[PDB]
């Protein structure tokens, strides 16, 4: 949710 999404 708060984590930066993967490329």
């Amino acid at each position, epitope marked *: 949710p*708060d984590t*930066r999404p*993967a*490329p």
Partner: antibody, heavy 116, light 113 residues
Framework: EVKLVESGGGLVAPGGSLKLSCAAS????????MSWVRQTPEKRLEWVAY????????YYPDTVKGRFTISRDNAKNTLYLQMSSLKSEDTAIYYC?????????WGQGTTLTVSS | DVLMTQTPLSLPVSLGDQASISCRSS???????????LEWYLQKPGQSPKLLIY???KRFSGVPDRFSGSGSGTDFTLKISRVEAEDLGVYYC?????????FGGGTKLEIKR
């Protein structure tokens, strides 16, 4: 405690190759994706590589794509960055990063100098 | 690529006073999922960068309450509400919505004494 310790830096001729290492400890290494960020002598920050927790989805900016290769050994708790066809513009301090919310934890860095 | 441009380049400020650091992107930075991944990093002299704020306004653990982030569209802002001497260093903004991920150029915070 979470400690990240980079190694392998030094001086390399233009066009040469060099592989960096990073020793991870203080957390479950296999659960977190990792990144490399570099800082140039102009103190500009550049993201250079990403890899997910399981070793997949290796991603790069086009400035190092085809030349740099990120990899990891979850048994040894180590992150790697193979470099090749090195240019002057690659000279920098290279930081190993445990990534989750953003770049959460940075190593102290190891220095690559590309010069004849 | 997304260009991140910071304002001012240097910022003198007295202890206990407020500091504001602006970030301007060359384009909107909303991920496919609707969220904005703008991050603030502080590099103190002789140290690695450290995360202060992610997702525009969420403080990373350990970051005191006086650090506050805001913004939308192309304009984002970091506020330090009661500067302490330990706050000096170079502040970088960063966008993690579009690839390649990009940093701003940095703003040096200088303490007046």
């Amino acid at each position: 405690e979470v400690k990240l310790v980079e190694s392998g830096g030094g001086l390399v001729a233009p066009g040469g190759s060099l592989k960096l290492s990073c020793a991870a400890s203080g957390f479950t290494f296999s659960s977190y994706p990792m990144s490399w960020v570099r800082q140039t002598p102009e103190k500009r920050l550049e993201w250079v590589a990403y890899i997910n927790n399981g070793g997949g989805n290796p991603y790069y900016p086009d400035t190092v794509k085809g030349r740099f290769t990120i990899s990891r050994d979850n048994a040894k708790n180590t992150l790697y960055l193979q470099m090749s066809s090195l240019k002057s513009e690659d000279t920098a301090i290279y930081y190993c990063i445990r990534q989750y919310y953003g770049f959460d934890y940075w190593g102290q860095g190891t220095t690559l100098t590309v010069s004849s | 690529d997304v260009l991140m441009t910071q304002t001012p380049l240097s910022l003198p400020v007295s202890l206990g006073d407020q500091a504001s650091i602006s970030c301007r992107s060359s384009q909107t930075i909303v991920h496919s999922n609707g969220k904005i991944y703008l991050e603030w990093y502080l590099q103190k002299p002789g140290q690695s960068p450290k995360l202060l704020i992610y997702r525009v306004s969420k403080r990373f653990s350990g970051v005191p309450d006086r650090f506050s982030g805001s913004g939308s569209g192309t304009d984002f802002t970091l506020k330090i509400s009661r500067v302490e001497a330990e706050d000096l260093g170079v502040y970088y903004c960063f966008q993690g919505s579009h690839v390649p991920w990009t940093f701003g150029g940095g703003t040096k915070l200088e303490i007046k004494r």
